[PDB]
Amino acid sequence: IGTGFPFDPHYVEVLGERMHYVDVGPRDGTPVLFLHGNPTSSYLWRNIIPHVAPSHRCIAPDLIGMGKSDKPDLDYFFDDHVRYLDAFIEALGLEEVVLVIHDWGSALGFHWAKRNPERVKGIACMEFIRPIPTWDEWPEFARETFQAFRTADVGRELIIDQNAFIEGVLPKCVVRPLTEVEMDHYREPFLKPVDREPLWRFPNEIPIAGEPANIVALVEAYMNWLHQSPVPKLLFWGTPGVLIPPAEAARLAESLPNCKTVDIGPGLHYLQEDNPDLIGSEIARWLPGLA
């Protein structure tokens, strides 16, 4: 699995801040928009993009506060990410798009799709944000830790002071062992502790047992849109998974219209680090059928 990032940097000024993004493949035609989540960046898509770039334009931004994008002093609530990504998409003049999304990138992509349905030609997703009804449904190996991330004072000490999302969650949620060069790429944006604010706000925004109520309402709304939408969907899943275990992927294969599911083999949350070649080759084979 490759460790390099052979992509020229591109920058665009959005809402007073510079955002970094990858932009490869043809300069025209329907673009494929890749959206990462917590605590990653466009580096998470480095081995998937090469399977797609020969046939389609590939665009992969780093969310505000992350990767090579600027890091303003924001609270980093979900709504801040919604504003910056909405402005990024308009600055590039995108019209119709295909979405490839993960984790908080999936909450951003599904929320954008619900608001701009006529502009989404297909959605490839994996390990995406959905309402988790009870803590029983969160997997045991990660339950107490996520509960601690959401406990006053304790969570900030773990994520901000100790960098637990990068040092702990990331490698423990990839089945194969990550290398030093890959982990140092993921550590680079967060060498200043104060910049770890988004990494702590994200787990505190996950809709679990009805809290926080504002995010639960937003996610219930895009899930209701997704269940009624005829847009083509491609869902990758792994065993045992984290947000989308095998039994959940089997339920979604029925309840999401026009959905093809792909079993990637062993995987926890960052599926792209366990089987990037199958994820990229299956997206490349599925895209032509969308025309």
Catalytic residues: 103, 127, 269
Q: Residue 179 carries which DSSP code? A: P
Per DSSP (E only), the strands in 206-270 are 233-240, 259-267
3-state secondary structure of 168: helix
Q: Give the chain's end-to-end CA distance (angstroms, integer).
A: 31
Q: Which residues are annotated as a binding site?
A: 38, 104
Burial (CB count <10 Å: 0-12, 13-18, 19+), residue 96: middle
What does DSSP assign to residue 134? Answer: S
* SS3 of residue 115 by DSSP: helix
Annotated binding site for iodide: 38, 104
Do residues 199 and 165 touch, judged by C-beta distance below 8 A? Answer: yes
Q: Are strands 120-128 and 32-35 parallel, antiparallel or unpaired?
A: unpaired
DSSP state of 279: H
Cα–Cα distance for residue pair 132/222, rounded to 1 Å: 14
> How far is 246 from 185, CA to CA, in rounded Å?
30
Q: CA 195 → CA 82, 102, 108, 144, 189, distances in Å?
A: 19, 22, 21, 25, 8
Q: Give the pair of three-digit tokens for residue 162.
A: 């100790």
Identify any residues that bridge with 179 across adjacent strands, giving them in sequence order.
Answer: none
